[PDB]
């Protein structure tokens, strides 16, 4: 296998006669294969949070588990997400969804969740007040394609309903491993916090777990099947 090309097959997966393990790779025998000298690993981390939010009841889709793209609310028109507190903001924007941290001085007063189509009305650090316009959803305003909403909350006041989620997203990052390095962890493993990933020539060139997540080996230098 040539430098940089990946394997369309997962490590330790049964492959068949003539079957494609890569764009040009042909396996002429039936059996199990294995990665040999991988040149990359994608480590997709998970991140929790506890964040509240609000939107009219004529919107709210009324679901507990919002799957990665489970349709969110209804929203007769472009409702303004209105601030319930004052503090410097934080635009954490993640794929289609945005996140906003409200902190005065140092400590955070609270964090707000902004699904797809819900746009930031202020650049990060720009001061906001209570009742101050924060976001705008319209129409669809659905959940992000990489995230998951756990543990729905219920608070009902007038037209605009309040709700909170524990929603936890994924923050993936990969690493390009080197000839002087070697992988210490199995394919598809679940890493701890600061887990040993790849031991290198110098102990410093090594890789640890950024926070916590899953390791996926890719770009193998070659693959052998028995």
């Amino acid at each position: 296998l040539p430098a940089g090309v990946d394997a369309l097959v997962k490590d330790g997966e049964e492959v068949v006669k003539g079957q494609e393990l890569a764009p040009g790779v042909v396996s002429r025998m039936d059996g199990v294969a294995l990665y040999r000298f991988p040149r990359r690993v994608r480590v997709d981390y998970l991140r929790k949070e506890r964040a509240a939010l609000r939107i009219p009841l004529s919107a709210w889709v009324e679901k507990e588990a919002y799957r990665p793209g489970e349709v969110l609310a209804e929203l007769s028109e472009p409702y303004l997400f209105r601030a319930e507190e004052s503090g410097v903001v934080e635009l954490k924007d993640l794929a289609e969804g945005h996140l906003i941290y409200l902190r005065q001085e140092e400590e955070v007063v609270a964090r707000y969740f902004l699904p797809a189509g819900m746009t930031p009305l202020v650049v990060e650090g720009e001061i906001v007040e209570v009742g101050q316009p924060l976001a705008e959803g319209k129409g669809l305003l659905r959940l992000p394609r990489h995230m998951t909403a756990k543990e729905v909350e219920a608070e009902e006041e007038g037209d605009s309903v309040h709700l909170t989620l524990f929603l936890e997203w994924t923050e993936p990052k990969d690493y390009k491993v080197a000839p002087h390095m070697n992988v210490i962890v199995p394919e598809g493993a679940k890493v701890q916090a600061g887990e040993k990933i790849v031991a290198a020539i110098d102990p410093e060139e090594e890789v640890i777990a950024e926070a916590e997540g899953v390791v996926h080996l890719h770009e193998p230098a070659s693959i052998l099947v028995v």
Partner: protein, 114 residues
Amino acid sequence: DPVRQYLHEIGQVPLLTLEEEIDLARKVEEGMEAIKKLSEATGLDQELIREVVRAKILGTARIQKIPGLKEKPDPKTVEEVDGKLKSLPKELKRYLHIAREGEAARQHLIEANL
């Protein structure tokens, strides 16, 4: 013809890349030091379980069967050892397998640079 024999016998295996080289040395030294830590386990010596690794790797009884009429006792000094660490928890066992793969690595290495 025994000359050209070995001449084609050596080229039967590729030599190595820098990667493969460093990897070889890696599992080699890790294996040997695993044997060290294993020497601290059941109280075995440094070189003992090493040649025992050869006893269960390099083949069946064929290894110590005929090294002259005297080399070192197989059924006495080897056998019990082969069964003494089989009774041991996860740590000493992982160190065991590390030893095995390590010595094998030594071999492959040797052939290339041969």
